[PDB]
Design a protein around this nucleic acid. Structure first.
Ligand SMILES: O=C(NC1(C(=O)O)CCCC1)c1ccc(-c2ccc(NC(=O)c3nc(-c4ccccc4)oc3C(F)(F)F)cc2)cc1
Ligand SMILES: O=C(NC1(C(=O)O)CCCC1)c1ccc(-c2ccc(NC(=O)c3nc(-c4ccccc4)oc3C(F)(F)F)cc2)cc1
Ligand SMILES: O=C(NC1(C(=O)O)CCCC1)c1ccc(-c2ccc(NC(=O)c3nc(-c4ccccc4)oc3C(F)(F)F)cc2)cc1
Lengths: 593, 593, 585
RNA sequence: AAAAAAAAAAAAAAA
């Protein structure tokens, strides 16, 4: 809709029945005209933000990865307030902004064509905010729309939404007051494939009042309830994708990309062909050894022989043969998993690594614990203090103080490297936040436990999913310090592989999709997998959930089976945890009163 | 004067008649003897500072610009107290120090020979300061003197002074108490060229008491008054330059450079000669293409044709040919401007680009506005708060708090680029300070309007002079918020092109030198010019002024005409501003009372 | 001792007689199993910390120095409280952690083989701390143990300890309460050579109550007392080294280096031989000529005429020949020093450079002074304020406030260079701390002088030991501001050169070891010497001491003579300082 | 410092 010469606008509607209706509006052609693409997004006439996307003129070939950057700029004037810092100006980004950056980055990054080496930057500025609303999902939609209008090698619009379960109804785009009445709230992002929605990213948590609401008669958020909630977000995503596509069509764009971006593949087909024809049988036979040192030595020897021969042949292309060898290895391993239920370390597909749990490991700490799962090793420490030491928050959003704080540390020696030790990175912030949300619904209230609580996790050893081990260590350490939890919490990380396998016969056209689910995946198994997801909770309901994938679709029964398998693993881990400690201890003599 | 063996000193006197007399003293040969040059400067034997200049041993020519660096170090013991921060130590430079750094950098950088690639660093430390004095103008002279003593390829001494207008007298080096009785305050820097002073830098503003002083019977600072102020500053500059030269002569120095610094010109003579002979007539006729896209297409076609022709001849020297082509293009465009008032975009000499102004653009802000001039687009937003939210300042200078704050942001997408989004750079600080000084003299007093005020400028699009559009946006947004200003303020950026060309006679050796003034210059037009300046004010008097040049001299009539042209331009802009809003609105329901 | 499967343990005992006994435990095999080496250390089962060492997979030859990094992580939960900053999280390292990093880095860095270019990182995390103890000396031992278990080209275990003098007894690992009753506090680190302890690093200071305790009957810490304190620390170091070696033996390790690390020497043997055989006699003759600028120009032309005739013989190896030429110059100069008592600037071995002192150089400052020694030039400024302006400290250690603050600045132009001006580096922090500790013992009490004091030193010109010059400048400025010091303090920096020399007999190969001590060394002389040390104090006792060395041993009489020479220089400097000012203004 | 031109397991020194 060309409201003005050169200005176009589009609208999407969110219908919640008796809970109200909301409108989302996209506008282009009036602000930031020198960017590659720019869009203004409105929610209900009082929420307003701007998104802009630009690309660099020339690529950076010497990089080995795609350089995408996302930035979120919160302005205090959006809340009608002057900043409280000493210099009265906005400084380094807050935790909320970093989490929003991660939420945008997770689904957009795999949507670009592989091999791209130009720099892409996306900047989102918050301009006006109603005191009872949240801006993050609107930001996801605006970033997608501006990138779509930028005319880049970018795959289709992406839609995002939040849904909260209230009295048996999944409400879309709820307010803070409404979220205060729900048992579960979930952020979901996806795209449209062949007229259907394919889910790409999920980030979900139980609310802080879930136990009291369930005692009052509400439904508890179990696995099937969460699956139904995933089903209820698809129409909203479809409406948002349609509005974005209409905006792109109205304002020209669509076809004629004009600017062409070169791509830099890791290896050429000619190099890959030689490596396959030379080392297929050797690699296939070598995997059956399964002896760690013997397996590694055989792999290294075959790699050295192949690289020597192909360096004699291709005359100075060593990285390409190295990449092709790894690709062939991964291709063989995936087929072996799908055919024989073979895992790289010899476990069955439902087996957990060796487990151990201990408490009281640090002499003068208020509480501490050590948790081990295979080569993953987490140390947790708890400290209690007076309630005035709660963190005071001066951000744009509605939060004003934080009674319970969780900090996560990942040093370089955890995997045996060297590196800088300094301020935490974005991934550390994300993992810490996910582990923090898993414990919040089970903490006691302030009136019955008047203390500030700080929890610290140290990843002393890493071989896959330290964030799920932080949950278990947090539970054990909090119980060791005398905090009266409502129920213990545990977590697990899971993977999924899938591909087309020909059934016993002929005609080579009866190949059908086949899926396999793996429990407690290794660090290397994540690269071979097709979907990753982490689940945490008590023995009665789920408290945190995270997911990201690339598949075009997933049958409902496959997802239900995977969720059930994760629940079984969680129960097994809770049984081991209970043997170390099963009730709160006495408070430490060193802690205050 | 050799007061001590190896120690020399020189004096300059500044006579203000009935307002007093002051002396500036330069000393060398005592402190910091391992630097290339070092000088100590005194003002009235209680203000004392040190300046030192050093150069790197080897050139580093993998850069394309001259690497000069200026640093100012404020020591809190110069005011006699311990720093108030948590660690009791001076940290990041304050705003005043950054502004002093830029005042030093602006005149000194073009005074070095072109092609230099050695790193040059200047450090100025403030050692002792009287409570009623300002140190910046003293620092300019010290920075010039220490560089002059270092035996570098540096063109002559530079003198700097501040003049303030009090009761019809222009007083040099005034105190803080004297500035409270003045209507105008100007900082001027220049050099000596054949017995006469050539002005190079100006930074000037109207004082905070100008309106009531003019109501009391003082003369308002109009354009002719400002020009008389520039005339009054020359004798002080001449005296300071003479003192510096005398000190340089007394301590040896003078000649005998000893160390020789290599230079790295952009292009050689042969390449320029070839490029000129190949394309002088092709470029001369190709400027007539009014169409922007057609113009640039023809330009790039000609450049590529020249590059392909000359690639084989010079074995591949593409940088030199690219530089020579641009040099020839600029040389021809300047001739077209001087001969027949040609402009690159087709405007006439006194034409402004298309203007637009609008208010009430951000839904929940206290006040907001959008201002557009050509491709320059500025968004301004106002916030009001309680008086306790004024900024508290802890610095060397006499200022202790700020009731009105202005912050200016320049994101990479405004030009279409990618880059870091972090703390603001020095140029952002400078532009914001200029725009703040433009609006200070018309604000209401605290007794009349008891609020703290924060103003933010976002440069959403930029093609030349965003700082002057910040002034218009600030006035519009402040009126939208309900602030009762005494008068609206507008600003404009101006250019000047000069050269001597053949007169309408014979011989081909008789040439007259002419000047052309351009209104509202583009970003590209700044590189074609010999002077650029900016003027802001009301319909009655000037409030801010900035000027940079490197011309040997400018006749009085030329400068008067340029200032009159700028006045007409800002009056035209004020008329357009008044249609959008001409009186204060009602204060927002969201603002406090 | 394998307490658990894969876990090994070892113990060391520190016996202080009637002052008590303490135990240190080392444990390995249970925490951080993916590092190259990791060790947990305990002191009396309430103090616990962890140390881990890792190495990079590939070298990096584009550097020209050995890249070693040391990090100390103080966790506030070790003290049982939440951090007080706005974000409630630990940020940049505090001054204490940086000084602990320096204490670890000083003795460990020269213990690696020459030419190593792999990156090496050591990280020490503080987990539990008793309120009356100090963790730094424990950290030294833990870092040594984890590096020794890592299987790297590392030269033997290193042991560190603190000893304090209380009522005539040197007590090892004293508590905070015990330090309040002592006159001197000293940190010492060393290693074992053929059954004996060789000292490598020393960092010592007098306490804040020394004057009052000496007035009450205690013995003042003179030079011989400090020398005896060095002897008293050796058995403790031996016991700690033994425990570390036992732990290394128990958990495998010991031999079998397995992974091999390439080395990158500055020059090859052939290049050095070619450079020496072409220029030895000529260079020695140039050294024998008594002239500074003449020898400078002669050497500069010799370098040009030697690089030019070997450029064809060695293909693009100019850096190798330059390094070999510099090494040969160093060897000849050291030989000349040991034989004829030669110094490059012509001074005698007990001579100080030209001195000058002046006060009241900054017009509005509360106190100010300018101090010059040779090309070293220091400016010092003092400011006084209300006692509420004292620094408030929130950290693991027992300190909570700081009445006297000293800040040291080292701008690039003091050498003639260009560089970044900004946050102070670790070396600036260390030098400032040494200068602050030298002056703390003579300050008046808060009761008789109720002010906060900030002292700033700025190295306007540097050619060797600005740290000791800042002590003199601070004394002068404090007196100029009116602070009633109990006594003035001065300092000096000293060097020592040692090597084997031919006897006056025969056989051509019968040699003896000789030592020579130099007063007030230049920056260039620090590279020639085998040991360097700095001493500061009053006319009656020592207040600060710092020492670094690599020698396998030092006879007692040689060290006593060196300390006496330093004391004589200190007295001369105090006499020059008394002329400028001899009482508070 | 002058100028429109982040993803992932992958400090030492006068210089
Ligand atoms: O912890 C982790 N991440 C976090 C978590 O909490 O989870 C903690 C911090 C944030 C999240 C983590 C994640 C990934 C890894 C990992 C390590 C190694 C390999 N790499 C191979 O694993 C391999 N590489 C080869 C090969 C290479 C070149 C040529 C030929 C072969 O072969 C093989 C073969 F499969 F055999 F083992 C993959 C992943 C470890 C830990
Ligand atoms: O917005 C601004 N804002 C600022 C303000 O406060 O003002 C904010 C902070 C300071 C600035 C700004 C915006 C753009 C510019 C700019 C200037 C020059 C060129 N350069 C060409 O533009 C060009 N390059 C060629 C050429 C190149 C290669 C070969 C041959 C020819 O030709 C040409 C031809 F002149 F014709 F147009 C571009 C942009 C400056 C300022
Ligand atoms: O100020 C200082 N302050 C510090 C302090 O102490 O607190 C502050 C914190 C720590 C230090 C300081 C100042 C200067 C130095 C320094 C040392 C060595 C050299 N280097 C030569 O000096 C040389 N280089 C050659 C040569 C070069 C090329 C080829 C052949 C020979 O020859 C020679 C020859 F020995 F003759 F003099 C220069 C400067 C050290 C410290």
């Amino acid at each position: 809709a060309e409201i003005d010469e050169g200005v176009f606008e589009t609208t999407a509607t969110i219908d919640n029945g008796s809970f109200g209706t909301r409108t989302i509006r996209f506008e282009t052609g009036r602000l930031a005209l020198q960017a590659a693409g720019a869009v203004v997004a409105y929610l209900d006439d009082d929420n307003m933000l701007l998104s802009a996307t630009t690309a660099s003129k020339n690529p950076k070939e010497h990089f080995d990865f795609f350089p995408l950057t996302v930035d979120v700029e919160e302005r205090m004037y959006a809340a009608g307030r002057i900043p409280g810092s000493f210099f009265r100006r906005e400084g380094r980004p807050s935790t909320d902004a970093i989490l929003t950056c991660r939420l945008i980055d997770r689904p957009l990054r795999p949507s670009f064509v592989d091999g791209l080496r130009n720099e892409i930057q996306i900047v989102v500025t918050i301009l006006s905010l109603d005191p009872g609303d949240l801006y993050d999902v609107l930001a996801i939609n605006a970033a997608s729309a501006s990138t779509q209008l930028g005319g880049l090698p970018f795959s289709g619009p992406i839609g995002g939404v939040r849904v909260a379960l209230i009295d048996g109804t999944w409400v879309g785009f709820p307010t803070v007051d409404q979220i205060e009445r729900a048992v579960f709230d979930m952020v979901v992002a996806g795209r449209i494939v062949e007229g259907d929605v394919a889910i790409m990213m999920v980030e979900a948590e139980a609310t802080e009042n879930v136990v009291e609401l369930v005692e009052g008669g509400a439904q508890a958020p179990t696995e099937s309830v969460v699956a139904a909630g995933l089903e209820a977000a698809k129409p909203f995503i479809a409406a948002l994708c349609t509005a974005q596509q209409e905006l792109a069509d109205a304002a020209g764009k669509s076809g004629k990309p004009t600017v062409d971006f070169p791509v830099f593949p890791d290896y050429g087909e000619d190099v890959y062909y030689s490596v396959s024809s030379v080392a297929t049988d050797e690699l296939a036979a070598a995997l059956t050894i399964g002896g760690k040192a013997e397996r590694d030595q055989r792999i290294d020897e075959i790699k050295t022989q192949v690289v020597q021969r192909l360096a004699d042949t291709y005359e100075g292309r060593e990285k390409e043969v190295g990449a092709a060898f790894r690709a062939l290895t991964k291709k063989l391993v995936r087929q072996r998993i799908l055919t024989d239920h073979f895992r790289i370390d010899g476990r069955g597909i439902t087996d957990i690594r060796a487990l151990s749990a201990e408490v009281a490991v640090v002499p003068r700490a208020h509480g501490s614990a050590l948790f081990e799962r295979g080569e993953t090793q987490i140390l947790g420490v708890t400290t209690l203090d007076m309630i005035k030491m709660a963190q005071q928050i001066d951000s744009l959003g509605p939060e004003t103080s934080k009674r319970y704080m969780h900090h996560y540390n990942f040093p370089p020696f955890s995997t045996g490297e060297t590196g800088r030790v300094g301020s935490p990175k974005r991934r550390e912030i994300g993992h810490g936040a996910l582990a923090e949300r898993a414990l919040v619904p089970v903490l006691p209230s302030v009136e019955e436990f008047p203390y500030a609580i700080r929890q610290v996790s140290e990843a002393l050893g890493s071989n896959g999913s330290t964030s799920m081990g932080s949950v278990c260590a947090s539970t054990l350490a909090l119980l060791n310090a005398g905090v009266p939890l409502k129920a213990p919490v545990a977590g697990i990380a899971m993977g999924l592989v899938s591909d087309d396998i020909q059934v016993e016969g002929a005609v080579d056209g009866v190949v059908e999709r086949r899926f396999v689910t793996l429990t407690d995946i290794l660090g290397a198994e994540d690269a071979f997998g097709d979907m990753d997801f982490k689940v945490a909770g008590t023995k009665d309901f789920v408290t945190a959930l995270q997911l990201d994938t690339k598949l075009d679709g997933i049958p409902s029964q496959v997802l239900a089976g995977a969720l059930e398998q994760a629940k079984d693993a969680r129960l097994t881990i809770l049984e081991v945890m209970a043997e170390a400690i099963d009730r709160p201890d006495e408070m430490s003599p060193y802690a205050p009163r």
